[PDB]
Design an enzyme around this catalytic site. Structure first.
Site, PDB file in Angstrom:
ATOM      1  N   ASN A 279      -0.865  -9.336   4.918  1.00 13.83           N
ATOM      2  CA  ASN A 279      -0.694  -7.903   5.118  1.00 13.83           C
ATOM      3  C   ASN A 279      -0.427  -7.245   3.761  1.00 13.83           C
ATOM      4  OD1 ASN A 279      -0.435  -5.440   6.468  1.00 13.83           O
ATOM      5  ND2 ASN A 279       1.440  -5.983   7.572  1.00 13.83           N
TER       6      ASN A 279
ATOM      7  N   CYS B 143      -5.120   0.635   3.963  1.00 10.38           N
ATOM      8  CA  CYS B 143      -5.201  -0.760   4.400  1.00 10.38           C
ATOM      9  C   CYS B 143      -6.623  -1.293   4.381  1.00 10.38           C
ATOM     10  CB  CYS B 143      -4.616  -0.902   5.809  1.00 10.38           C
ATOM     11  SG  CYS B 143      -5.402   0.127   7.096  1.00 10.38           S
TER      12      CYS B 143
ATOM     13  N   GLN C 248       0.808  -1.220   0.000  1.00  9.76           N
ATOM     14  CA  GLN C 248       0.000   0.000   0.000  1.00  9.76           C
ATOM     15  C   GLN C 248       0.840   1.268   0.000  1.00  9.76           C
ATOM     16  OE1 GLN C 248      -1.437  -1.030   4.247  1.00  9.76           O
ATOM     17  NE2 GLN C 248      -1.472   1.208   4.243  1.00  9.76           N
TER      18      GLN C 248
ATOM     19  N   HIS D  34      -5.219  -0.941  12.014  1.00  7.46           N
ATOM     20  CA  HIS D  34      -4.715  -1.430  10.736  1.00  7.46           C
ATOM     21  C   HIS D  34      -5.558  -2.622  10.316  1.00  7.46           C
ATOM     22  CE1 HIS D  34      -1.810  -2.102   7.570  1.00  7.46           C
ATOM     23  NE2 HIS D  34      -1.526  -3.318   8.003  1.00  7.46           N
TER      24      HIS D  34
HETATM   25  C1  LIG Z   1      -4.679   1.538   7.964  1.00 10.30           C
HETATM   26  C2  LIG Z   1      -3.419   1.728   7.169  1.00 10.30           C
HETATM   27  O1  LIG Z   1      -3.392   1.908   5.984  1.00 10.30           O
HETATM   28  O2  LIG Z   1      -2.319   1.686   7.922  1.00 10.30           O
HETATM   29  C3  LIG Z   1      -2.485   1.557   9.359  1.00 10.30           C
HETATM   30  C4  LIG Z   1      -1.152   1.555   9.998  1.00 10.30           C
HETATM   31  C5  LIG Z   1      -5.499   2.837   7.903  1.00 10.30           C
HETATM   32  O3  LIG Z   1      -4.820   3.867   8.598  1.00 10.30           O
HETATM   33  C6  LIG Z   1      -6.906   2.666   8.465  1.00 10.30           C
HETATM   34  O4  LIG Z   1      -7.865   2.670   7.702  1.00 10.30           O
HETATM   35  N1  LIG Z   1      -7.043   2.531   9.783  1.00 10.30           N
HETATM   36  C7  LIG Z   1      -8.371   2.472  10.369  1.00 10.30           C
HETATM   37  C8  LIG Z   1      -8.471   1.389  11.442  1.00 10.30           C
HETATM   38  C9  LIG Z   1      -9.173   0.109  10.993  1.00 10.30           C
HETATM   39  C10 LIG Z   1      -8.683  -0.301   9.618  1.00 10.30           C
HETATM   40  C11 LIG Z   1     -10.682   0.298  10.966  1.00 10.30           C
HETATM   41  C12 LIG Z   1      -8.786   3.836  10.922  1.00 10.30           C
HETATM   42  O5  LIG Z   1      -8.213   4.312  11.899  1.00 10.30           O
HETATM   43  N2  LIG Z   1      -9.762   4.472  10.272  1.00 10.30           N
HETATM   44  C13 LIG Z   1     -10.320   5.761  10.647  1.00 10.30           C
HETATM   45  C14 LIG Z   1     -11.790   5.627  10.992  1.00 10.30           C
HETATM   46  C15 LIG Z   1     -12.127   5.842  12.465  1.00 10.30           C
HETATM   47  C16 LIG Z   1     -11.195   5.047  13.366  1.00 10.30           C
HETATM   48  C17 LIG Z   1     -12.093   7.320  12.817  1.00 10.30           C
END
Ligand SMILES: *[C@@H](C(=O)OCC)[C@H](O)C(=O)N[C@@H](CC(C)C)C(=O)NCCC(C)C
Length: 212
Positions: free
Chosen positions: A175, A25, A19, A159
């Site tokens: 992953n 992710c 990615q 993640h």
């Molecule tokens: C995951 C990624 O690409 O790398 C993580 C190290 C993204 O950051 C991601 O979509 N994270 C996600 C948590 C899981 C996948 C639901 C997230 O924090 N999304 C934001 C929505 C909400 C928590 C405000």
């Protein structure tokens, strides 16, 4: 359900992807489950478009994160293109689904695994690849290069990845950090610890697509 499941051995898992710096992710995780369910139902393994979900899911935040559930809901409502028709650019752009012609596949719905329950997740994995979440921020997870991982890690999930199998003492995870991370891009996370959260919070929030 059996002692071992590995959807790679059934030809239902495509190669490992990277990615990059984009927080996409959630889209990679959803696509793994689509690739799996289409193989299971139709007999054909194809690659589908993470970029389309990145661009088109108005419930998610592009490269600033998102939700496997809303990505899978979008594929059930509309459909999804092949990866080569709509390939990964690592940056959010406008939704280009219409100009890229008819969708390549479509699902019928989305279901959640009963959370905080190891056996329920194993049962779902025995049927198809499942989208799962975990805490990846810790240096131990970042630096993982092989073996059955037990942490250190907490439960602050951040993640999304895909569970594509399991064995007696682990769950097998694809992953999206390229083939140079982990075991050719995979991690085997220990199970059976009695922690209802799962190691690294693995049992927190799991979804899979439904296709009749
Ligand atoms: C995951 C990624 O690409 O790398 C993580 C190290 C993204 O950051 C991601 O979509 N994270 C996600 C948590 C899981 C996948 C639901 C997230 O924090 N999304 C934001 C929505 C909400 C928590 C405000």
């Amino acid at each position: 359900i059996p002692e071992y499941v590995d959807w790679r051995q059934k030809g239902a898992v495509t190669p490992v992807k990277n990615q990059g710096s984009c927080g996409s992710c959630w889209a990679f995780s959803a696509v793994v489950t689509i690739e799996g369910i289409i193989k299971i139902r139709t007999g054909n393994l194809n690659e589908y478009s993470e970029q389309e979900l990145l661009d088109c899911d108005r419930r998610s935040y592009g490269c600033n994160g998102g939700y496997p559930w809303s990505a899978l809901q979008l594929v059930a409502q509309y459909g999804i293109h092949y990866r080569n028709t709509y390939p990964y650019e690592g940056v959010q752009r406008y939704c280009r689904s219409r100009e890229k012609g008819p969708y390549a596949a479509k699902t019928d719905g989305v279901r959640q695994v009963q959370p905080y329950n190891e056996g329920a997740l194993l049962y779902s994995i025995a049927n198809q690849p499942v989208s799962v979440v975990l805490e990846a921020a810790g240096k131990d997870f970042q630096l993982y290069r092989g073996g059955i991982f037990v942490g250190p890690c907490g439960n602050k999930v951040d993640h999304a990845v895909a569970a594509v199998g399991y064995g007696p003492n682990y769950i097998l995870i694809k992953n999206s950090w390229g083939t140079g991370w982990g075991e050719n891009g995979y991690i085997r996370i220990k199970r059976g610890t009695g922690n209802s959260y799962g190691v690294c919070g693995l049992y927190t929030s799991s979804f899979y697509p439904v296709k009749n």
